[PDB]
């Protein structure tokens, strides 16, 4: 069990931790979050009571350092920082928890939800998408753009997702034009799986990272990336049987955790009808199909 203390809470904000969140009032004595499960990545995120737009947050892993939150009144946001002094850190944490000014990470033990959403998300792979290597944690907000969105402007703040494009030389072998664009298997298995991602777990990890950025920050470019990574599999007649069965689990839990009221911007009607009813893989997403139908029959 690990802890993320907060120096203070100068402004009224809604704090989120993974899929949990709490209201914190301006200058309420709030000093952090305790009992965070070691072993997964986590993300802590903020929505000021004043500015309902820009949700922003930090991806992190406690195994990689002792991390803490201080509000910066010049920049006007909660910042994640690393305390390098081992002793001085356990000292602040012990004091605040003895003062009990900390909320507990509220995990029901039947619940494998966070694990299911983050199974393939590695912190090292996150820091290649949010390149800022002076920090062991990664900042994301509502407004950041992806690299593919930058092709069609500041690369420091880019989400460096893997570029997928069905109508590109990368995706289409000369002479197999028709075959490759109806059956993406080539593009998935050789170019993407064996070429770029090396294995299905890094693929799935980016897919899942992309979903969570869409969900927690309504990052519109993350939403695009997530659907593209889904379309590519579902549009492939030849997929490792293990990857199909994992994908059905991954989507189930993503569709399950999504807020009911956001189904309109976060779910692309075309992709989902194509994956569930038109694609090669229509018959291979039994769990995801069933949840989609009973919960969002409208979109289909």
């Amino acid at each position: 069990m690990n802890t993320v203390p907060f120096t203070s809470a100068p402004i009224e904000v809604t704090i989120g931790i993974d899929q949990y969140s709490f209201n914190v009032k301006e200058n309420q004595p709030f000093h952090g979050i305790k009992d965070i499960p070691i072993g997964h990545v986590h993300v802590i995120h903020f929505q000021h009571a004043d500015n309902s737009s820009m949700r922003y947050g930090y991806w992190f892993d406690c195994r990689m350092g002792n991390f803490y939150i201080q509000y910066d009144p010049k920049d006007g946001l909660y910042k994640m920082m690393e305390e390098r002094d081992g002793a001085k850190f356990e000292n602040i944490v012990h004091n605040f928890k003895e003062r009990q000014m900390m909320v507990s990470y509220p995990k029901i033990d039947e619940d494998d939800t966070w694990y299911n959403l983050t199974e393939f998300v590695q912190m090292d792979k996150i820091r290649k998408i949010v390149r800022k290597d002076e920090n062991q944690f990664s900042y994301v907000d509502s407004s950041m753009t992806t690299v593919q969105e930058n092709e069609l402007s500041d690369p420091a703040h880019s989400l460096n997702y893997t570029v997928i494009n069905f109508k590109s030389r990368e995706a289409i072998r000369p002479g197999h034009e028709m075959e490759d664009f109806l059956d993406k298997s080539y593009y998935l298995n050789t170019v993407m799986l064996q070429g770029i991602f090396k294995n299905s777990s890094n693929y799935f990890g980016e897919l899942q990272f992309a979903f969570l950025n869409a969900m927690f920050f309504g990052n519109y470019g993350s939403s695009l990336q997530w659907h593209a990574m889904i379309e590519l599999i579902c549009s492939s007649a030849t997929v490792p049987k293990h990857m199909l069965d994992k994908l059905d689990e991954i989507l189930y839990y993503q569709i399950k955790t999504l807020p009911e009221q956001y189904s309109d911007i976060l779910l692309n009607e075309r992709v989902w009808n194509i994956c569930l009813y038109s694609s090669f893989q229509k018959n291979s997403l039994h769990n995801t199909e069933k949840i989609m139908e009973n919960k969002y029959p409208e979109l289909l």
Binding site: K167, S168, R169, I172, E177, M178, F181
Partner: protein, 237 residues
Amino acid sequence: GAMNSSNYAELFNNDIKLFVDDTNVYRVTVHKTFEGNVATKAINGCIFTLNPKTGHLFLKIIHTSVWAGQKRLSQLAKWKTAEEVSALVRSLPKEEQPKQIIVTRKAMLDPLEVHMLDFPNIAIRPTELRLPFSAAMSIDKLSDVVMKATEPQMVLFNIYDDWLDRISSYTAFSRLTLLLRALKTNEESAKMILLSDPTITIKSYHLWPSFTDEQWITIESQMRDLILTEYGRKYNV
């Protein structure tokens, strides 16, 4: 973006562009089998690729052999169209390659786009116009050369004959599409109108008769009248 009545005079500026009509690529007759089932027989077809400024027609004849042993033919026809258009483009010297290709049917965008990937600077565009290029096979000489062909083969034509020697592309293009509009809506009568007078002939190197300027007026008016008559009949107006 899409071509419609607004951006209509663009066809006649000096940017090379071609229309691609795929409607006569995959042609079948439908018949009954001995057991009573229905079967299709394919006949030869044609890709209709036209430069509307100059009249240069690149008629790529599609031999029935191309379908032999193939499934989902109406889908394949679209891909063979794009393969053949791309090959036409690659075969043209650079200064002659089009800057835009306008497909007459939206379903052709994705095959063409995928086939033109080596020409990112050629824009593939749809159109909202209702062009009558399907009636290309109602022009006797084009239907003939398609039907006689015994192998894949490209045949060059100028679809305007020698009209540009006396009129503008805009006008040329309007005569053409009027004549084909009429041919689509009532072939028997349209053809009656073009050939009634045996003293106006078609030059061996031409597709249409050698009407005088005065005679082209009478013809365009008869085409017009036919089209409006046929519309009345279709809708009871």
